[PDB]
Structure 1
Amino acid sequence: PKPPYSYIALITMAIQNAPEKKITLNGIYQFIMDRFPFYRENKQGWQNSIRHNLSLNECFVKVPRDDKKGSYWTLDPDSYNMFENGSFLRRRRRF
Structure 2
Amino acid sequence: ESKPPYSYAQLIVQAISSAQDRQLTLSGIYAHITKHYPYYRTADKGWQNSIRHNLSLNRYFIKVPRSQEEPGKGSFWRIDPASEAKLVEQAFRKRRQRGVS
Instruction: Settle same-fold status: TM greater than 0.5.
Output: yes
What's the CA shift for 1:38?
Answer: 0.7
- 3-state SS of paired residue (2:63): strand
Question: Of the two, which has the highest radius of gyration?
Answer: 2
Mapping 1:52-63, distance limit 5 Å: 52-63=53-64
Judge conservation of contact 1:14–1:23 (CA < 8 Å) in 2: yes
Distance in 2 (CA, whole Å) between partners of 1:77 and 1:70 is 16
Instruction: Calculate percent identity across the aligned residue pairs.
Output: 54
Judge conservation of contact 1:23–1:73 (CA < 8 Å) in 2: yes
Q: Please, what is the CA RMSD of the aligned residues?
A: 2.8
Matching residue of 1:19: 20
Instruction: Count residues in correspondence.
Output: 88
* Runs of 5+ unmatched residues, structure 2: 96-101
Matching residue of 1:8: 9
Q: Does 1:29 align with 2:30?
A: yes
Paired amino acid for 1:11: I
Distance in 1 (CA, whole Å) between partners of 2:37 and 2:59 is 25
State the TM-score, normalizing by the size of structure 2. Answer: 0.68
Judge conservation of contact 2:14–2:91 (CA < 8 Å) in 1: no
Q: 1:59 to 1:85 in 2, by over 3 A?
A: closer
State the TM-score, normalizing by the size of structure 1. Answer: 0.72
Q: 1:55 to 1:85 in 2, by over 3 A?
A: closer
Judge conservation of contact 2:10–2:90 (CA < 8 Å) in 1: no
